[PDB]
Design a protein around this ligand. Structure first.
Ligand SMILES: [Fe+2]
Ligand SMILES: [Fe+2]
Ligand SMILES: [Fe+2]
Ligand SMILES: [Fe+2]
Ligand SMILES: [Fe+2]
Ligand SMILES: [Fe+2]
Ligand SMILES: [Fe+2]
Ligand SMILES: [Fe+2]
Ligand SMILES: [Fe+2]
Ligand SMILES: [Fe+3]
Ligand SMILES: [Fe+3]
Ligand SMILES: [Fe+3]
Ligand SMILES: [Fe+3]
Ligand code: NA
Ligand code: NA
Ligand code: NA
Ligand code: NA
Ligand code: NA
Ligand code: NA
Ligand code: NA
Lengths: 169, 169, 169, 169
């Protein structure tokens, strides 16, 4: 076995590799939304900045899981990062609704990964996932839900522009 | 020949004199737009200051070409600065669409001037035009495109006022 | 046509999209090398940090090309980011030799993209590529060449450790 | 019952007393390694300081568990602190390999103590152990694994001396 390995099951190791790829995938989706709102015919620069920041956060989530894999004596196995499902993301409201679905799918994957750790008595991995991932996902999901509600309230046109200026900046 | 002159074709010299006049013309157009948005019956003061600043930048572009003409040993020959095509420029959206057309025509003139330098092997003039003019024009055309998109999004009335207050200020 | 588009050929637009993917691919390679030297059984933390930094730099190279695509009126089309060719990278010397080959392939691809711009008279794109990409590539290639020479000089064992402590950070 | 006692099983109380002694034992092992590397015929002062620091940390781990025992209404019952298995600890590599085994034994004991808390539904004790002990043990085991790898890489003689100077201090 690797030097650090203790109470670390191969199924947990494999599950961490799967979650690493999912975090990178999310980072790529947000990078695409970033550059979509940077288009001259969309031109909402604080939305663009918001997705730039979320793309960087997802990349950090991936690297923290990579570091954790190494810390436990697992071996990182990278997979292709699949391109996002769309090249264009619609209105600010539609992009936020897409983001809510993405963050809920990531959250479900983390909960499933936590279940693997629980199944194998990996108390430290469960605590790592809870404090470093599950808590952040609950915060992120509520924040996106707030965005969607406000975007529905302000409507299209001037409301989108003001939301870019007031909340997203 | 003038003391500095080296690898500097009379056709490039003549082309710089033509471009100097075009920069001064663009400066005059923006000065007219500045004072149009300064009218009591238009009264959008940040739009006014935006065109004031662009008028000053265009004058700086013309003076930098005048200095370059002297530096290469060319001789500056000034022409009349033609008045702008209109006395009044319509809505903020229409004024910005007019500005996009102006900046694209200046850009095409600069590209044509670059072709003259290339035809005569004027490597230094090509680099001067690329770094000091071509790059700036691409940035300017994108920025104006962003303005047009945002002005379409916010609409007339309150939207034009808020655009003045948020983006243009 | 998109609002900004001027003197911008579809072949150049397509080549930029291809180069974006290659920059992202190189970022992924360096991220893998980062986490490889982070392994408990490799444990060279300044090599790790070097590849972390180079991964971040490649991601910025990609995003600068994405921003340039938008500025010229092109449309970003993302593709899958392929996983690196290896899961582990051997010695510090072998990883640096792999890095040299990677940077030379990126450089040849950028030179080929420059040839597309030249073919279509895209003066501004050539200057953008020269100043923002070609210059950095010859600096990076020389720097990696220096690393390879020093790694050959110091040998394996204590030499790799000291190079980590003294040159890499 | 003692005033604070709530949801605190006698088996968990006894397990904490056992772990207190194990932390004290680890502290004593590190204090011995500290003074071994302080010997005139070993004379690696940064290794010495490293084990001095680790001896203090283990003593703090013990005192934090004693404090927790009191907080829950348990009663501390101290046992003899057994002397370390050796009087001399060999090479830096051998000492680090011994410490990896020690930290893995401590980690297994903590995981077994966590199982006792789980068996009796002691949610607060499980969280205390996870956040204050299990996380630290995973970090410590990885750090020692790094040391072992580097010590194998640099070899004996000058490599040991340089490791003392560069990494340990
Ligand atoms: Fe994430
Ligand atoms: Fe739990
Ligand atoms: Fe917990
Ligand atoms: Fe100009
Ligand atoms: Fe690059
Ligand atoms: Fe040429
Ligand atoms: Fe050139
Ligand atoms: Fe150039
Ligand atoms: Fe301890
Ligand atoms: Fe405001
Ligand atoms: Fe305001
Ligand atoms: Fe040093
Ligand atoms: Fe030193
Ligand atoms: Na923009
Ligand atoms: Na694939
Ligand atoms: Na006024
Ligand atoms: Na005249
Ligand atoms: Na490490
Ligand atoms: Na001494
Ligand atoms: Na005894």
């Amino acid at each position: 076995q690797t030097q650090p390995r203790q109470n670390f099951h191969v199924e947990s190791e494999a599950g961490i590799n799967k979650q690493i790829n999912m975090e990178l995938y999310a980072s790529y989706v947000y990078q695409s939304m970033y550059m979509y709102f940077d288009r001259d015919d969309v031109a909402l620069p604080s939305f663009a900045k918001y997705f730039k920041h979320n793309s960087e956060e997802e990349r950090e989530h991936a690297e923290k899981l990579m570091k954790y894999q190494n810390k436990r004596g697992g071996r990182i196995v990278l997979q292709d990062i699949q391109k996002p499902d769309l090249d264009e993301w619609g209105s600010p409201l539609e992009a936020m609704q897409t983001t809510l679905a993405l963050e809920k799918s990531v959250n479900q994957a983390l909960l499933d990964l936590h279940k693997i750790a629980d199944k194998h008595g990996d108390a430290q991995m469960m605590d790592f996932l809870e404090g470093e991932y599950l808590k952040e996902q609950v915060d992120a999901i509520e924040e996106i839900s707030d965005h969607i509600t406000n975007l529905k309230r302000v409507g299209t046109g001037l409301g989108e522009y003001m939301y870019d200026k007031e909340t997203m900046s």
